[PDB]
Amino acid sequence: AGGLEHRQLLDLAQKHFSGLSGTYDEDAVPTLSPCRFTGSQICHREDGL
Amino acid sequence: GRQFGHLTRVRHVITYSLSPFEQRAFPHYFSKGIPNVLRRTRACILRVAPPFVAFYLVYTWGTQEFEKSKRKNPA
Numbered sequence A: 001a002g003g004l005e006h007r008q009l010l011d012l013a014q015k016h017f018s019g020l021s022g023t024y025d026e027d028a029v030p031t032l033s034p035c036r037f038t039g040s041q042i043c044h045r046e047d048g049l
Numbered sequence B: 001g002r003q004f005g006h007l008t009r010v011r012h013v014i015t016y017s018l019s020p021f022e023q024r025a026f027p028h029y030f031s032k033g034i035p036n037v038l039r040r041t042r043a044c045i046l047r048v049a050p051p052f053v054a055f056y057l058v059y060t061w062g063t064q065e066f067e068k069s070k071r072k073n074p075a
Helices: A006-016 B029-070
Strands: A040-046 B011-018
Antiparallel strands (some): A040 B011
16 A cells, blocks of 8 residues: 555566465365354452552 | 452452353253262261261150050059
């Protein structure tokens, strides 16, 4: 973001990022599992504060 | 009357609690509860029981004796 043409950013991308692995592993693609929310409570009692 | 925030001093103690809609109200009621009743009974039976056993024997003897004394004996 700033004073720059989108063209030059794409050129620099193909110039300095083409050397990057775009081929994932056979079955090692990470997938985010949903995270269980839990109604709960945590109380760190510290009266010195 | 005392109030919360003025009771006592506590430091470095963490408490983890779970919501009541997230857990069972009767978790392992018989699978865990019956063993605990037997543990507590054993721990206190010798303090509570012998007095009332002593009462039961004095109760029955006094009633038996009172019954026999009211029956007459040949002269």
